[PDB]
Amino acid sequence: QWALEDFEIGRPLGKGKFGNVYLAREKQSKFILALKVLFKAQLEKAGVEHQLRREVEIQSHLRHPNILRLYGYFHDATRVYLILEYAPLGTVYRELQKLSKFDEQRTATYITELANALSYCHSKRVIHRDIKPENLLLGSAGELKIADFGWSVHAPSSRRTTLAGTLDYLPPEMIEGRMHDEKVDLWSLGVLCYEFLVGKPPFEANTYQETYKRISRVEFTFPDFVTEGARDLISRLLKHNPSQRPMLREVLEHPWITANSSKPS
Ligand SMILES: Nc1ncnc2c1ncn2[C@@H]1O[C@H](COP(=O)(O)OP(=O)(O)O)[C@@H](O)[C@H]1O
Ligand SMILES: Cc1ccc2c(c1)CN[C@]1(C(C)C)C[C@@]2(O)N(C2CCC2)C1=O
Numbered sequence: 001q002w003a004l005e006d007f008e009i010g011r012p013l014g015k016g017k018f019g020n021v022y023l024a025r026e027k028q029s030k031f032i033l034a035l036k037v038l039f040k041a042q043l044e045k046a047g048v049e050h051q052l053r054r055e056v057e058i059q060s061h062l063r064h065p066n067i068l069r070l071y072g073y074f075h076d077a078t079r080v081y082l083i084l085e086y087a088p089l090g091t092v093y094r095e096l097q098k099l100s101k102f103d104e105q106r107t108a109t110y111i112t113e114l115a116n117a118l119s120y121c122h123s124k125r126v127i128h129r130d131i132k133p134e135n136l137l138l139g140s141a142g143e144l145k146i147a148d149f150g151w152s153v154h155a156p157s158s159r160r161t162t163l164a165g166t167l168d169y170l171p172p173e174m175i176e177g178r179m180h181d182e183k184v185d186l187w188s189l190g191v192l193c194y195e196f197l198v199g200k201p202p203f204e205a206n207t208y209q210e211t212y213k214r215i216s217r218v219e220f221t222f223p224d225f226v227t228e229g230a231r232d233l234i235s236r237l238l239k240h241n242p243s244q245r246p247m248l249r250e251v252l253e254h255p256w257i258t259a260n261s262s263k264p265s
């Protein structure tokens, strides 16, 4: 339906593994959006066609203020183009680089917005599986929006695709290649809450092999400035046994969250 000729392309918004994302304007409507570009040759050698179909199918059917919209796609001889909602305030990754650490109020507010979006996802038995700061975007009023559904699926699930990037956000069950479910996103939420308050994720290390060891043994410690309440919530999320991880409703009702968040559920 859409073709490249229908858009004026502007500045690069960011880069992905596959994914070179550009600002764009549809010529007839002047609608401003983002165009995620992927090279067919690369997708073909990686053999990830099935993941790309999921990304479009899942994200296009989702409707929630804290989830980035995907409006459709087109392709030509060499590329695939995903048509996305434009997020004008950048990534949470950038904001963390800018400030080093977030205060309690900013952290609790982001966690509420994340928990709200994940709650909507899990009600449809969708799991995201790639929650991390570079995949969290910011709207015009500074509100958090979950993006990048390339790894998402319907639960329960195994894993039929090789992990390439960082282990930092993955739970023990996913790393050890065991069966997994929705509780994976709750572990990642714990990792994020720690990284927001401290400046770095709790299992970070110099080698893949050693990060693997720290994750599977759940070895993490807190700096002195992390408060009693934040410690409580984080320790409840980072449980080795996934059934012991809280429901999202319990996250949204945690005393430390409700005391510090400027957003409702
Ligand atoms: N809709 C968007 N608005 C603004 N920036 C974006 C948007 N989508 C992606 N980006 C930027 O491009 C980067 C890569 O996009 P992403 O969809 O995560 O690609 P990949 O699947 O390769 O990780 C993001 O981390 C962000 O910096
Ligand atoms: C969202 C989306 C998922 C899958 C694919 C497209 C778009 C682009 N169309 C096809 C054509 C029809 C063969 C089908 C395809 O699998 N694909 C991939 C090869 C690498 C891109 C293509 O070229």
Ligand SMILES: [Cl-]
Pocket (backbone or CB within 6 Å): 053
């Ligand atoms: Cl398709």
Ligand SMILES: [Mg+2]
Pocket (backbone or CB within 6 Å): 016, 134, 135, 148
């Ligand atoms: Mg990404």
Ligand SMILES: [Mg+2]
Pocket (backbone or CB within 6 Å): 016, 019, 148, 149, 150, 151
């Ligand atoms: Mg992707």
